Amino acid sequence: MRFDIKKVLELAEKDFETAWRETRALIKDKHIDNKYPRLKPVYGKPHPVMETIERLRQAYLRMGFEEMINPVIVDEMEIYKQFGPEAMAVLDRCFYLAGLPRPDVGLGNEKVEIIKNLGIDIDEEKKERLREVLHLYKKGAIDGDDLVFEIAKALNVSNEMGLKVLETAFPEFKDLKPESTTLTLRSHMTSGWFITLSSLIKKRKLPLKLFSIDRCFRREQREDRSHLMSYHSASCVVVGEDVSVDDGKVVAEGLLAQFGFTKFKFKPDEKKSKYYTPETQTEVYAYHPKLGEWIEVATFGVYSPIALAKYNIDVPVMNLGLGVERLAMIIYGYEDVRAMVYPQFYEYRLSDRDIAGMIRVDKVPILDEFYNFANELIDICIANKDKESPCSVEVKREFNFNGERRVIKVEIFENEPNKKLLGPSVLNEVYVYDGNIYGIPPTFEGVKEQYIPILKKAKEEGVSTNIRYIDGIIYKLVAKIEEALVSNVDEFKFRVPIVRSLSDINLKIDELALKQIMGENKVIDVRGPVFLNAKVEIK
Amino acid sequence: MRFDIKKVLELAEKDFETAWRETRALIKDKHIDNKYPRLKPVYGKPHPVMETIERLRQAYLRMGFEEMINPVIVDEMEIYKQFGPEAMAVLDRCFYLAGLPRPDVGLGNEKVEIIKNLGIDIDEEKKERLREVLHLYKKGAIDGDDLVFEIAKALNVSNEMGLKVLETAFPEFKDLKPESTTLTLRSHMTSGWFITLSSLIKKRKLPLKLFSIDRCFRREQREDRSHLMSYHSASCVVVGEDVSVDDGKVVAEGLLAQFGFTKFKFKPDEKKSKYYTPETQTEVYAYHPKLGEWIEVATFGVYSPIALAKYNIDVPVMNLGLGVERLAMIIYGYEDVRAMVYPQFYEYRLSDRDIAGMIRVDKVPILDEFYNFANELIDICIANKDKESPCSVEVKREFNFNGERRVIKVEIFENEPNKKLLGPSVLNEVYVYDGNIYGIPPTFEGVKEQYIPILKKAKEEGVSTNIRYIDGIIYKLVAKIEEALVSNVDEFKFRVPIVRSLSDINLKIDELALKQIMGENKVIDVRGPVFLNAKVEIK
Amino acid sequence: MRFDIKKVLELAEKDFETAWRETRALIKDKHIDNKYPRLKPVYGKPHPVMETIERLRQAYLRMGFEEMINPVIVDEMEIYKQFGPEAMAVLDRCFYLAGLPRPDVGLGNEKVEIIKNLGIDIDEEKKERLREVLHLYKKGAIDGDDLVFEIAKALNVSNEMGLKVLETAFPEFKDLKPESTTLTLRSHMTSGWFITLSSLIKKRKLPLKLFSIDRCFRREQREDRSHLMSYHSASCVVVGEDVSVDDGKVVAEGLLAQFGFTKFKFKPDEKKSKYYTPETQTEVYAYHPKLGEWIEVATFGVYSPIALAKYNIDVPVMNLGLGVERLAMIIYGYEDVRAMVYPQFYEYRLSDRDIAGMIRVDKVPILDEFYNFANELIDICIANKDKESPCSVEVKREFNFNGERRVIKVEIFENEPNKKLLGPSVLNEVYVYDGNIYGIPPTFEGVKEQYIPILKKAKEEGVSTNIRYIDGIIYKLVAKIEEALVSNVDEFKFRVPIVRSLSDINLKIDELALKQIMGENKVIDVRGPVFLNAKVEIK
Ligand SMILES: Nc1ncnc2c1ncn2[C@@H]1O[C@H](COP(=O)(O)OP(=O)(O)OP(=O)(O)O)[C@@H](O)[C@H]1O
Ligand SMILES: Nc1ncnc2c1ncn2[C@@H]1O[C@H](COP(=O)(O)OP(=O)(O)OP(=O)(O)O)[C@@H](O)[C@H]1O
Numbered sequence A, B, C: 001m002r003f004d005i006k007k008v009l010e011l012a013e014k015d016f017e018t019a020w021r022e023t024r025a026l027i028k029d030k031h032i033d034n035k036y037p038r039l040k041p042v043y044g045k046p047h048p049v050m051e052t053i054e055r056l057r058q059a060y061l062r063m064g065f066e067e068m069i070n071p072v073i074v075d076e077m078e079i080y081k082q083f084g085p086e087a088m089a090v091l092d093r094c095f096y097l098a099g100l101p102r103p104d105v106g107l108g109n110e111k112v113e114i115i116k117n118l119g120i121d122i123d124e125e126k127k128e129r130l131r132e133v134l135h136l137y138k139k140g141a142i143d144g145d146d147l148v149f150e151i152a153k154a155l156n157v158s159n160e161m162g163l164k165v166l167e168t169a170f171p172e173f174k175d176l177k178p179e180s181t182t183l184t185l186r187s188h189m190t191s192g193w194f195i196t197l198s199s200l201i202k203k204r205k206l207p208l209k210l211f212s213i214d215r216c217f218r219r220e221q222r223e224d225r226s227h228l229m230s231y232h233s234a235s236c237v238v239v240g241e242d243v244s245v246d247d248g249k250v251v252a253e254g255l256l257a258q259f260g261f262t263k264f265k266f267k268p269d270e271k272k273s274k275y276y277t278p279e280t281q282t283e284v285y286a287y288h289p290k291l292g293e294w295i296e297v298a299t300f301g302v303y304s305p306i307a308l309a310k311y312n313i314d315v316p317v318m319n320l321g322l323g324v325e326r327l328a329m330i331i332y333g334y335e336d337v338r339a340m341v342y343p344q345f346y347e348y349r350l351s352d353r354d355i356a357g358m359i360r361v362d363k364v365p366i367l368d369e370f371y372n373f374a375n376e377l378i379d380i381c382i383a384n385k386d387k388e389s390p391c392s393v394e395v396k397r398e399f400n401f402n403g404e405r406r407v408i409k410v411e412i413f414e415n416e417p418n419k420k421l422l423g424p425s426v427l428n429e430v431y432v433y434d435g436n437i438y439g440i441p442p443t444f445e446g447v448k449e450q451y452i453p454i455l456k457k458a459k460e461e462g463v464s465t466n467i468r469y470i471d472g473i474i475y476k477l478v479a480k481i482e483e484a485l486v487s488n489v490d491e492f493k494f495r496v497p498i499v500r501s502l503s504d505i506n507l508k509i510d511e512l513a514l515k516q517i518m519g520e521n522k523v524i525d526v527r528g529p530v531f532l533n534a535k536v537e538i539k
C-alpha cells in the first residue's frame, strides 16, 4: 500500500544520508505495461483553422472592432441590390436554397389494408387519429422529426411500427422532389453586411468598426489546393464620413502584423466587382514559404455609393475580407486546403515514438508476488550473464497461497563448456528508427560491419522501447510459472535459443503499427543469440 | 510644450513640499471637449454567441477531445443511410442545395447591332473574342466574378461597358432559374460525423474523442424565441468498444460544470430518431433563470449499429450535441435567440452615461490664450458670485498677435441694487438621470418642493456632465471675444438673464440622444436665474 | 469483440424496424463499476485569480495597451526618488531583500579527522581538491545547488556522502545569518514603471499606453479578508503631452465595463501619496453583492512632475492600478481573499453528486460469463418478485471452463406461506440528498408517515446511485458462485433477510465521503425487508 511515515522519519533521523539513499525502494517503478514510452500523454488538440479563427477574433478585437453575426441566408434580390446588373452573372457562384414540399396524402382503403396486413388493429378511431396526423403534416404543423412519433401515437403502436407504417403505407413520400426558392447562401460577408448596416447605422454613433468571422459558400468549378465549397471569411466594415481605401490598407496591415507578417503586398483586383466603388477593390498578398509563391489572403474595398444608397446608407464604408483558410495554410505550412481542413480523409502517419509505444510485452505475471519475482530474476540473470560455463544459477523461493505453501525452484543454467551463462544478445534493447524496428546490442562486438553504421544511427537518433530481450524473456518465464500453478504442473523446462522475431522475446506490436511498417516497406529486425536454458520445479 | 526638468528639480530641492504642491500647475487639465464623461473608452466588444463558442472549444479541449471539422454539405443519401426509411420524413427539415445553369447563348446579328448601338466598335475579331468568352462561360470555364472582365477584355472596352454589354445584349441571363440537386446542408453534426468516422476509424487508435463546434441548418416552420434557420452545434463523438449512454451523461456534466452549472436534468427523447440505438436518445435540460423555465441545451445518444454498419463502423459511438445559442441564452440572460444573435435588428438604448457624454459645449475659444483667459474668468466669476450689488468686476489684459497688441477689457457687472453679482443658479451642474437631463443647483434653497426629492435623487444616482452653467456661459463669452477680433468689432455687450434651455448656457446635445429622450418621452429641464451682464471693450 | 457488420446489414435489410429495435442488444451496457454517476467527468480547472488575470490582459489588450514586464526588485533609493521624503515612512511597507554570506572555512586536521572517521579515505590529493571546492564556494564560484556534488566529486565519494561530509565536518554553515541589502521588492507597479519609462520614453513615439499584470508585495500588519502579503496589480501607464486624470477615469471604466460592471464610483484618496500630483490620486469602487458593501478595486493618478523629473521624464503620465484579487472577489463572490486565493488550506465539501459517485458495489463477478449471468438473474428476480408463496424459481445453466463443464443450479425461493417471493423493499434505490444517504422504495405504502415527505423530497431533489437493493444483492450472490468454483464448494445457501446497512446490500462508501457524512452529522439510512432466500448447487 503506502509507506510508514513513522519508520521513514526514524530511519532518516538515525542517519539522513543512508536513509535518503535506501528510501528509494519505497518508490515502486511502474508496471512494465505503463512505463515510458508505452505511457502516452493525453491532451486536447485544436484544429488549425479554428485556432486561426480565434486568433483572428482577437486580432480584430484588439483593434477596437465590435464583433457581429450577420445573416447567412439572403434573398437573391439582395445580391441584385449590391452587385447591380452584374448579379445576373455573379449569382452563378451562389448556392440557392431548395426544399421538399409537404405531401398531400390520404387514408383508405388500400392503405388501411396495408396497415392491417402489418399486424395492426385499426379502429375507426385510430383511422381518424392518423388521418388527422397526416392532415397536420400536410398543413405544416408537424415536424419531420416528429412524424414517426405522431403516427405511432395515433395508432397506439410501437415507435418502430410507426415508421413501418410510414414507409410501407405511404411510400409516395419518396417521390417528393425539392423545389427551389429565391433564397441563397451568402458567398461572402458583404451580402450580410449591407443588410446589417442598413438597419444599424441609424441607431448608432459613427464611426463604426464591425467584424465577423463566419462561414461563406461559393459554387465553384471544383475544389482546389486553395478553394473550397465552404470557407471562413474574417470580415469587417469600417463606417464613417471620412473612410477611404487607406482604412482597408491599415486593417490588412494590423491583422497581418499580429500574426507575425512583416511583408505583404497590395494589388488591384481586375474584377472591379460592382459592389465596390471603381478602382478601390484591392487584393492583399502574403508569402507562403512551403509553396514558394505569394498567395491571396484578403480582399478589400469601399462600397459603391449606389449600393449604399439602395440600402439607405449615405456614408462611405470600407469592407475587408480575409480568407481564414488561406492565412491558416501559410501559418501551419499546409499546401492544400482540403488536406488541412479535413485531415481525416487523408493519412495519419505514426512517428518513431508512436510505434515505440505500440510495442507491448505479451505475457506478464498477474500476481504481484511473481511480478516482483520476475524483476529480481531479471537482475539476477543480468548479474550472471558472464558466468563461465558450465554454469548454473539457482533461485529457490517459497510462496504462500492462503493455507498452502509452495516452493518454486527456478534454475537457469548452461551445461556445455567454453560458453557463458547467457550469450551475446541478452541485453539487446529494442529501438525504433525511421519507421524501422531494430533490436540492438549495447556494443557492436561481433556485429557484421555493413550493419554497424545503421544500428549506431538508430541507437543514436531513434526512440527506445526501454525493453531488453532479457526483460520479455523472463516475464514470459515467470508468467509460465503462474500458468503452471493454476494448471497443476510441477515441472517444466523453458528455453530461448536464438532470437528471430519479436515473438521470440515475448513482445508484440499493435496491428496498426504493423500495417504501416509493412505498407512503408520497412523492417522489423529483432535477432540475436541468447541461449537461456531454465528448469523450474514446483514442490 | 513640456516642462523644465532643471527648474522643477531646483524648485523641489529648495523646498520639496511647496514644490510638490505648486508643481501641480505643470499638469494641464484637458480641453473641455475631452474631459470625462465626454471622454469615452474604446475597446473591442465580443459577441455572446461567439464567446460561448470559444468557451465551449476550451471546455471540450480540457476534457481531452480532439477538434475536427466535418463536411457541411452532404448528399441526401447520407441521410437515408443514417436515418433509414425515416429520412423520407426527416429530409423535410433539411435545406436542399440548388443552383443556376450556365446559359447557352450566341452572338449575332441582333446582338451585334445592340452592341454597336451602345457606341462600341466591333471588328470581326472582337466579335470572335466575345463569341469565345460566351462559349467558355457556357462550358463552365469562366467564373461569374470574372465575366464582366472577360467581356470587357474581349471587346477592348471599359469594365463598366463590359457590364453594359452583358445586361443590354444578353438579358436572357435573367431568365435562368435555379435547379435543385441531391446535395443538402447538414441539419445536425451527425450527418458529417458518420462520414468523418467512416474514413477515420480504420486509420486511428481507439478510443477516439472528437468534437466540432460549427454551423447547422434546419428548415423550420418559423423562427422562435429558441429556434433559428441556422444554429451552432457543439458536437462530439466518443468512439470505443465499451462506449455507452453514460459517456453522454458524463460529457454533458463536464461541459455544463465548466460553465458554472451545478444542476441539469436528463429526459428521454420521445422522437427516438432512427440514427440512435433504441432508448438511448436523451435530452439534457438546464435552468434559464430569466425565463423561469427549464430549457433544452443538448441531446445525446448512441448511434445505431445499423447506421454504423452502413458506414463500415463496427464499434459503438456516443454522440452529443449542445446548441450553442441555447446555452448562450442561459448564460447572458437573453430570452429570445433572434435578439441575442442579431442585435443589430433591434434597439440600442443609451444609458445615463451615454447621454451625459453626448452633451457638448457649443462655442469655445480656439486660441490657447483665450481658452485659458476663459478659465480664469470663470474662476473669477465663481469668486465674486456673491458680491453685493451694485457690483462690477473688471479684467483688463493685453494680448499680443505678432506685431500688434490689443487690450481686452472684459467687465462683468450688476447695476441694480439689492442683488448680488450673479444669481442663484450660476453654479448649477448638468446631470443625467433615468433618461432625463436636469440642470441642478448645489443646494435646494428656494427650490419648489415637489421638485426637491426628484432633483436630490438625480443628483445622487444620475451621471454628471461636470459642466456648470457658468462654464458654458463664459466659454461662449470669450469665444465671442475671438469672434470680435476677427470681425473688426471693438465693443459689445453680452448677457444671460434667465436660463431656459440647453442652448442658453451654450450647450447642445447629440441628435441621437435627443431622438431617444423624446422617444422615451422624458425631459430636458435646464432652468435657473443666472443674471450675468458683461461688456467688453477691445482697444 | 466488436459486432458483425454483414449480419447486421442483412438483418436490417430483411426488416428495418425489427432490426433497429433488436440491434440494441449489440450495444453492451457498461460494467456496473463504470455506470453513471460513478463515472465522473475529468477536465482541467482554472483558478479564479489567474482566470481573472487573463481576462484582464485581454481587457487591456483590447484597449490598445502594450504589455510589459517591469523590474520586480528595486533599490530603496528608487522609492525615495518617487515618494520623496515620504519614503522614510512608506518604505516600512516594503520588504527588504536579504541573503546569507558565503562561509570562510578551511580544512585542517580536526576536520580531516572527522572525514576519516566517516569511513572516507582521504589522500593529500583529495584533501587539496576539497580545499579548492571550499575556496571556490567562499569566492562565490559554486552555487549552493552544486556544492554537495562538488564535494563528492572532490573526495571521490557518493553524492549522499558528499552531503554527509558537508553537514558533519562543516556544520558552521548553519551559523550563517542573513545580511540585509538596500534592495526591496516593489509594493506596487509604479516602482517599476518609472524605471521602465525612464529608459523607454526617449526611444519611442508618444503617446504610450503600457500595461503589466504582475506580483507586488506589501508588509501589512496582518492579512485581511481583503489584504495579502503578496497581490497582483493590473497596472498601466498612459504617457503623453495631454494626459490628465480623465485618462484614468476612462481606463477604469473600460476595464470594468468589459467585466460587466455598469456601476462604479470615484473617491479622493486621503493619502495624497507624493508620487502623485496633488489632488489627482483617485480611488475606484465597485459593488460586491455578497458582502453588501462597496469595495476598492483600483487606484489611479498622475505622477508628480518632481518624480518624473528625477527620472528624466518631461511629460505627464497617468497611472492606474487595479487589484486583481479584489476584482476576483467580486466576480466569483468570495468574501475572503485568503480563502479564494489559497483554497487548499480550507475545506472541500462533497456535493450530493460527489457522494453518490463514491458509493461502490463491493463484490461483483470477475468472469464475463457470470457477470451476465448475474444481470439475467437480477431481471428474473425483478420479474418474479410477486409470485405468491410457496414459490421457487430455478435457473440451471452450464458453464464451460476449457475441458470441463459445470452445471450451476441457482434456485431462489420462499417456502413459508402467505408471502411473496421477494418482499416490499427489494427494488429500493439508493439516493443521496442534502448530505444524506437514503435507500428509498418506489412507492410509499407501509412507510411511516413522518418519513414520507422527506423520502419524497430526496427522491425528487436528490441524486441517485442508480443502484437498487436487488442489484448489489445478486452481484454478491453470483460473486459467491465464482468464489465457490475456485474454492471446491458444490453447494451453499445465501440469504438476505432484512436490510440494515449498506453492507447488507453489498455496497460500500468511500472513506472520504463517510468522514463528511459523519462530520456533518447526517444519516445513512438504508433498510427494508427484502427476504431473499437462495440455494446454489454446482454439479
Ligand atoms: N473557395 C474559397 N475557399 C477559400 N477561400 C476563398 C474561396 N473563395 C474566396 N475565398 C477568400 O475570399 C477572398 C475573395 O475571393 P475572390 O473571389 O475575390 O478571389 P479568388 O481567390 O480568385 O476567388 P474566386 O475563385 O471565387 O475568383 C479571397 O481572399 C479568399 O481569401
Ligand atoms: N432551430 C434551432 N436553433 C437553435 N438550436 C437548435 C435548433 N434546432 C435544434 N437545435 C439544437 O439542437 C439540439 C437537437 O434538436 P432537436 O430537434 O432534437 O430538439 P427541438 O428543440 O425540439 O428541435 P426541433 O424544433 O427541430 O424539433 C437541441 O438541443 C438544440 O440545442
Ligand SMILES: Nc1ncnc2c1ncn2[C@@H]1O[C@H](COP(=O)(O)OP(=O)(O)OP(=O)(O)O)[C@@H](O)[C@H]1O
Binding pocket: C218, C220, C226, C227, C228, C229, C230, C231, C232, C296, C297, C298, C299, C321, C322, C323, C324, C325, C326
Ligand atoms: N495587501 C493587498 N492585497 C491585495 N490587494 C491590494 C493590497 N494592497 C493594495 N492592493 C490593491 O492596490 C490598490 C492600491 O492600494 P492602497 O494601499 O492605495 O489602498 P488600501 O486598500 O488602503 O491598501 P493599504 O491599506 O495596504 O495601504 C488597491 O486598489 C488594491 O486593489
